[PDB]
Design a protein around this ligand. Sequence first.
Ligand SMILES: [Cl-]
Lengths: 216, 9
Amino acid sequence: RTEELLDQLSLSEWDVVEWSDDQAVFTFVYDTIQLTITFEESVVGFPFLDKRYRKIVDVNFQSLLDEDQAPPSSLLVHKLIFQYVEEKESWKKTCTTQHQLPKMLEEFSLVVHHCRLLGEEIEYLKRWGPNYNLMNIDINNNELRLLFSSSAAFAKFEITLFLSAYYPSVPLPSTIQNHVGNTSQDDIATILSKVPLENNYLKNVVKQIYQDLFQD
Amino acid sequence: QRKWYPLRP
Ligand SMILES: [Cl-]
């Protein structure tokens, strides 16, 4: 974990799996995401062609995740990653020659890299969440539903966090459905804005809630 | 984590 966190600084999100005359293929996320780059056809091999002028015919992203078998966290990861691909239109207008491909794989890797880690934080909160009084986690379409419950603190409420592809730098939007006690929106706004927009924002925001509210 | 990231058959 400390070892790899260092690893994160220089990103390594993809495997090259074909480098044809015809196409270059790259996988991501344990290979559940597949990028096929198709090149224009030529009368010569690509060894004879200048990469600054080799035209890209196509850019085709694919999810190969088993949606029946996947857990919700993994599903949310794919939801968010491809929401970004949609926004960038598969880089079809800007990534047009082979020359431009590394800066695209970088741009994409970064979002793949944070979204995959968000997946990780969720599976974690799913196993240690009780210690934070986080009794349940519900994922529904870009919405993260956190249920905190403690008789002892006499508080029970549900916080809904709205996630995007751009995690975790963007400040999350939230709402609170209150069950027991009187935690207000302002109390939540506060706790959130005291956590920096960098890795583990979810984990840290949960721990922040568990101190501010369940450890008085 | 193949567990969490299964592939279509
Ligand atoms: Cl040829």
